[PDB]
Structure formats: structure tokens, C-alpha cells
RNA sequence: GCUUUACUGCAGGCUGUCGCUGAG
RNA sequence: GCACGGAGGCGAAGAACCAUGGAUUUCCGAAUGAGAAUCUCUAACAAUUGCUUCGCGCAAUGAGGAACCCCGAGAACUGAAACAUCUCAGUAUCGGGAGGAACAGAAAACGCAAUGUGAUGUCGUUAGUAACCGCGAGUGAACGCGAUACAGCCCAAACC
Ligand SMILES: [Cl-]
Ligand SMILES: [Cl-]
Ligand SMILES: [K+]
Ligand SMILES: [Mg+2]
Ligand SMILES: [Mg+2]
Ligand SMILES: [Mg+2]
Ligand SMILES: [Mg+2]
Ligand SMILES: [Mg+2]
């Protein structure tokens with residue numbers, strides 16, 4: 028497919044939201060990313 | 074048009090307006106259809122002018138027949154703004170009544186005659 | 193911090209602009225040092241640089257430039 | 258108002274371009290054209306920009322590969338920052 | 339041809355997409371109309387009383 | 395003595411006789427060639443207009459609207475219906491043509507508000523009404539002690555809420571006693587039974 | 589759901605009449 | 613900040629924090645220069661209107677809102693132990709629109725008929741009364757009264 032500049036921005040954001048809760052955040056909160064999205068098992072919008 | 078049953082020659086209309094102008098300065102004139110209607114009804118009208126470019130025509134339809142059953146003479150003018158200017162207004166006028174002419178009672182009286190003859 | 197509001201108002205319209213472009217540069221170089229994984233950082237400033245820039249722009253607006 | 262240049266894009270590949278092709282790499286505002294990038298870059302580092310290549314990245318930012326003239330030395334321009 | 343699984347293979351057509359006005363993946367790119375907010379059809383926002391129980 | 399206006403009124407008591415009859419026969423020819431809403435410089439029935447609030451002043455507007463004659467232009471049922479609800483031909487709208495006319499005019503002038511309206515006749519297939527609209531934002535009106543009331547916010551879209559003279563009569567609010575049990579204060583608060 | 593000379597109605601078609609609509 | 617890490621920083625130049633007012637406030641969005649799945653293309657109140665210096669010069673409308681409110685369109689399941697009028701119900705749902713509340717409102721009223729009452733909402737009652745109805749099932753007011761709150765005016769025309 029041919030993605031537009033805006034679609035590309037959205038996909039970029041989704042990839043970024045796909046990172047893990049940083050280690051230090053665990054220590055800072057004395058103790059999960061519920062928005063984890065696999066490319067195969069999940070489906071993005073549009 | 075529907076209330077106009079005879080055509081007034083250009084020259085006659087000029088004499089009429091002219092007379093009207095000397096009437097506002099020397100005698101008395103009523104400007105406006107409501108004030109004119111009352112002249113004819115009160116009998117104080119000597120010569121009434123009625124424009125022919127009045128829209129709606131309803132505003133002046135009654136002048137003719139009313140003038141007839143009151144003896145009052147009437148003359149048609151083509152331009153509404155000419156009658157108003159002649160009467161001394163900055164705006165136009167659908168009808169005017171020379172309420173007792175002035176230094177024109179002669180030309181006036183004759184204009185009434187020319188029209189009566191114009192049938 | 194190192195740059196107070198009084199000091200910004202005691203500047204001439206031209207000094208704020210000169211000071212403004214100066215802070216932007218410090219900022220840009222801090223980001224470059226950061227982009228290069230450079231550790232000689234001091235987090236408190238790259239944050240102060242932003243606020244200082246905001247103050248100056250706020251004052252330039254209040255004064256009419 | 259947004260600024261043209263955001264920061265130098267420094268990665269292994271950017272180094273090779275700098276050391277072997279006299280090019281500098283930046284993260285610029287995605288609303289910036291090659292021309293705006295060329296100008297902004299010259300005015301900030303006092304150099305002569307010969308060519309600019311751009312790319313809208315999968316990071317959501319724009320990347321510009323700016324080649325400098327033989328008169329300028331990328332290696333040096335980048336070392337002062 | 340089976341109307342089930344075998345007919346699922348030809349589905350590579352893009353219709354509903356992220357809507358510019360409401361953010362939902364309901365902007366039908368073929369019709370240029372959002373099935374969720376009405377964008378492209380109505381200046382007013384799409385909404386109906388049957389979207390909730392009658393007395394609520 | 396009789397006002398000049400009284401003559402316009404008297405002529406319109408019988409639009410099918412005298413000079414008026416001929417004017418109409420002439421006018422309608424041009425009207426039938428005009429659009430749905432035509433702004434006119436002067437009211438066809440000056441007496442009626444002034445009587446309803448018209449003033450030769452800035453911000454006062456008049457427009458003639460034509461609307462088809464007859465019952466509801468209704469589509470037949472496309473699902474189950476008991477005999478009582480299967481009609482099409484004899485069903486008529488509860489809003490009179492004059493009111494339809496007022497709304498079509500107001501929509502044409504989104505910034506103006508309807509003051510009142512009156513009939514100017516009809517031919518075999520349509521009726522004409524002239525609507526008087528007012529510019530609530532013009533200072534010549536905001537300073538008129540007789541019309542400024544129409545400038546208040548609660549008067550916005552008055553025609554669409556039945557606050558018009560034709561609206562109120564058509565709502566059954568004419569009578570103050572017997573017969574208005576289901577109309578006053580509103581049709582809706584009375585459960586929609588008038 | 590379907591049918592018809594089942595019951596009752598509703599579109600639609602035909603036809604008279606009134607309005608548009610006037611002169612001899 | 614939630615958020616208790618690491619590093620670093622700010623605060624007696626009175627920070628944090630709270631109140632009020634101000635600044636900033638990307639893009640799409642009624643979305644308004646034009647086009648577009650939030651981007652793009654070469655000055656913009658697009659569109660409809662009022663005024664008009666007839667020039668977008670001065671203005672209006674658009675869309676939102678928990679429900680309430682006003683004006684239009686308007687079912688069926690159901691009840692009648694079937695069903696057609698009736699009933700469910702002017703309900704559900706749909707179209708248009710206002711406000712902080714709407715709407716109504718100073719009698720061509722009432723009609724305890726009077727030597728009487730005196731704008732309008734609403735609450736209590738009048739009363740399941742009068743009235744409607746395959747006179748079946750069902751449906752269903754008002755005047756008055758006791759309260760709440762109270763407020764009365766402007767045009768058109770005559771004559772100028
Ligand atoms: Cl209105
Ligand atoms: Cl009483
Ligand atoms: K039924
Ligand atoms: Mg990655
Ligand atoms: Mg490219
Ligand atoms: Mg199938
Ligand atoms: Mg109420
Ligand atoms: Mg646009």
C-alpha cells in the first residue's frame with residue numbers, strides 16, 4: 028500500500044506506544060503495558 | 074396603468090409641475106398620498122397630482138374615482154421623483170394636492186381645463 | 193533561576209532578542225550534546241533554558257517588544 | 258513559532274556520512290523544505306550547504322542529510338557541539 | 339464456492355478509516371462519510387435517541 | 395376622515411372584484427415566474443403591513459413567498475399499518491400554509507427574524523404571502539421603542555418555535571376560555587392533544 | 589411468506605363536479 | 613503531578629501550593645480561500661443574509677450542551693383474553709429551533725346566572741365528576757375553590 032504523511036505519523040506513534048514501561052518507573056512506583064500491540068495478533072486502525 | 078385612463082402629453086405635464094412649484098412657494102400644497110386623500114375628502118383640494126410609476130398601484134388606485142365624485146380635478150405625472158421634487162421634497166411622492174394654488178390660480182385653473190378636455 | 197524577571201525587564205527590547213537568540217543556542221547545543229548520548233549533562237538547565245525563553249517571550253509581549 | 262533545526266542526528270551511519278562524504282545529518286521540523294533546511298543550517302553554523310536530502314521518518318520526525326562544500330569540513334562543524 | 343472461509347480471502351479493500359473529525363475508524367474512504375460522527379454528510383454531529391434506553 | 399390606507403384595505407376585502415382583480419391577474423403572471431422567496435422593496439398591502447408592525451425604516455424587510463396549495467405531500471406506508479393509519483390522500487399537515495411561508499422566508503434570511511405576515515392571494519395551485527422580517531442587529535431597530543423588543547435573545551428563531559402571530563393562532567391559543575384546555579400554555583405540555 | 593369472486597381498508601387508473609377561469 | 617528510581621535542579625531575589633486576572637494556545641474540527649481519512653495547494657467572513665461609504669467596509673447566521681423547553685413528522689408489539697373503530701399513544705423514534713429556564717399572559721374571558729369573578733403559569737382539590745366509547749374494553753376535562761407568585765403595558769388609525 029501507499030501511506031500518506033499523516034498515516035505515517037500515526038503508525039510511528041503506534042510503534043512508539045508499543046514500548047515497555049521503563050525499569051525506573053517500577054522502582055519509582057514500587058510496582059504492565061496494557062496497550063501492547065503485536066503486528067500479527069493485533070490490528071491497527073484506518 | 075390600471076388607474077390611468079388617459080395620457081398626459083409631455084408639455085402639459087411640465088406646465089403642471091411648474092404650477093405645482095409656484096404653489097408650494099405662493100400657495101399651499103399637500104405632499105403624500107394620505108394627506109392628498111384627505112384634501113379630496115375635505116374638499117380643500119383644487120388640483121391633485123398622481124404619479125404613474127407607483128408600485129404597488131394599490132396606494133393610488135382610489136384617487137381617480139374619489140376625485141371624480143368630489144369634483145376635484147386630477148392630473149397624471151410619469152415620474153414619482155419629479156412630483157416629489159416639484160412638491161419640494163428630497164424624496165419622491167406618489168400623489169400631491171395643490172391646496173389653494175398661489176400666483177398660479179390662473180395657469181392652474183387652465184391646466185384643469187386642458188385635462189377635462191383631454192377627457 | 194540564574195535569570196530573573198527583573199533582569200529581563202531591565203533589558204532593552206534589543207537585549208531581550210539578543211538574550212533570546214542566545215538562550216536558544218545554548219538549548220540547541222544541549223540537545224545536540226544529548227542527541228550524542230553525551231553525559232556531561234545537568235538536566236536542571238536544559239529545563240531552565242526553556243523557562244527562561246518563555247519568560248523573555250512573555251515580557252517581550254507585555255512590554256510591546 | 259517553530260524552529261527549523263531540532264538537533265543533530267548522530268548515529269553510526271551519520272558518522273560515515275560526515276567522515277566520508279562531508280555531510281551533516283539533522284532532525285528538522287517536518288514542515289521544513291529542503292531550502293529552509295539549507296538556509297537554517299548555513300546561518301547556524303556559518304557554512305556553505307551544497308545539497309539537502311530529506312526523509313519523513315518512522316519516528317514521526319523529518320531527517321535531513323546536508324552535504325557541505327569542499328570549503329567546509331563536516332567533521333569540524335560537528336565537533337564544536 | 340463456500341460463502342465462509344474461502345470467501346474471506348478477497349478482503350483486501352480499504353473502506354472505513356480514521357476520521358479527521360471524530361478520531362474513530364469510521365470514515366468510509368469510498369463514500370467520504372463517517373458512519374460514526376456523520377462527517378461528510380452532516381455539519382451537525384451524528385446522534386440518535388435510540389443509542390440509549392428510552393427513559394435515559 | 396378616511397385614511398388613504400383604508401382604501402387599500404377595502405380593495406383587498408374583495409380581491410376578485412374591481413381594479414384589484416385586474417392587478418392580480420396581471421401580477422401573478424410575473425409572480426409565477428419568480429422564485430420561492432422574493433425580497434420586495436414595498437409591501438403589496440401597505441395598510442396590512444403597517445397594521446402588523448411594518449415601518450419604512452432601515453432593517454425592516456419584506457419578502458413574498460409562494461407555497462403549493464393542498465394537503466400533505468405524503469408517502470404511503472412501507473410496513474405494517476392498521477387501516478386507520480394507511481391513509482395518504484386525505485391527510486393534511488397541522489401547520490397552515492402561511493406558516494410554511496414564514497419559515498421558508500426566515501431560512502432565506504438567517505440573520506433576520508419574522509415579525510408577521512399576510513396573504514396576497516393565490517392562483518389554482520399555489521398561495522402567496524408577504525412576510526415582514528426585522529434585522530435585530532441594526533441600530534435603527536435596536537433604538538426603536540416599538541420594535542426593539544424583537545432584538546432580545548429569547549426572540550431568536552421565533553418563527554420556528556411558533557411565536558409568530560400565525561404560529562399562535564394555528565396553535566389554538568386564540569381563545570382564552572372554553573376550547574383552550576389543551577392548547578395553553580403549550581401544545582407539548584398538554585401532551586400534544588390539540 | 590403466499591393466494592383468492594374471505595372480511596375490511598389503502599395506493600393507482602377511469603369519469604362527473606368546483607377552483608385556476610376569461611370574451612361573444 | 614499520579615509515581616516512593618537514578619542523576620540533577622528550584623526555593624529567604626519567598627519556591628511549592630490556592631484564588632483571581634493576563635500571556636502563550638500546533639493540526640483537524642460549525643470549519644469559512646480551495647482541496648484532503650488530522651495533510652496539501654495559490655490571499656480569502658465559504659455559503660445565505662441586513663446595512664451599505666455598493667469595498668466583505670460594518671454586522672448576523674452555522675456548531676455544542678445532562679436533561680429540561682417550544683414547534684413540526686409520527687409507529688408497532690400490546691390491551692380488548694380473536695379483531696377492524698377503540699387501546700398501547702400523540703408514546704418510541706425522526707425533522708427544526710430557544711433559554712438559563714422555556715412556553716403562556718392583561719379577556720371578542722368566566723357563566724357557583726350574579727347586585728358575582730377579573731392577565732398567565734404551577735401546586736392541592738374539584739373528580740375518575742361532566743363528556744367520549746364495537747355505549748365493549750377502555751378514555752377523561754373544565755368553571756370554581758384553597759394556595760404560590762403577582763404587573764401591567766406598546767402599536768395600527770383618527771388628528772398633526
Ligand atoms: Cl424568525
Ligand atoms: Cl366566579
Ligand atoms: K393495533
Ligand atoms: Mg523499535
Ligand atoms: Mg523523497
Ligand atoms: Mg450469505
Ligand atoms: Mg409549562
Ligand atoms: Mg478548509
Ligand SMILES: [Mg+2]
Pocket residue numbers: 692
Ligand atoms: Mg387482543
Ligand SMILES: [Mg+2]
Pocket residue numbers: 692748
Ligand atoms: Mg369484546
Ligand SMILES: [Mg+2]
Pocket residue numbers: 751
Ligand atoms: Mg387518549
Ligand SMILES: [Mg+2]
Pocket residue numbers: 754755
Ligand atoms: Mg368552564
Ligand SMILES: [Mg+2]
Pocket residue numbers: none
Ligand atoms: Mg408612540
Ligand code: NA
Pocket residue numbers: 066067068069070071
Ligand atoms: Na495486522
Ligand code: NA
Pocket residue numbers: 263284318
Ligand atoms: Na528527535
Ligand code: NA
Pocket residue numbers: 499500501502503504505506507508
Ligand atoms: Na431567519
Ligand code: NA
Pocket residue numbers: 576587588
Ligand atoms: Na384537539
Ligand code: NA
Pocket residue numbers: 589
Ligand atoms: Na413464512
Ligand code: NA
Pocket residue numbers: 637
Ligand atoms: Na489555554
Ligand code: NA
Pocket residue numbers: 657
Ligand atoms: Na462571519
Ligand code: NA
Pocket residue numbers: 668
Ligand atoms: Na461587502
Ligand code: NA
Pocket residue numbers: 693
Ligand atoms: Na388476548
Ligand code: NA
Pocket residue numbers: 694
Ligand atoms: Na392473534
Ligand code: NA
Pocket residue numbers: 697698745
Ligand atoms: Na370506539
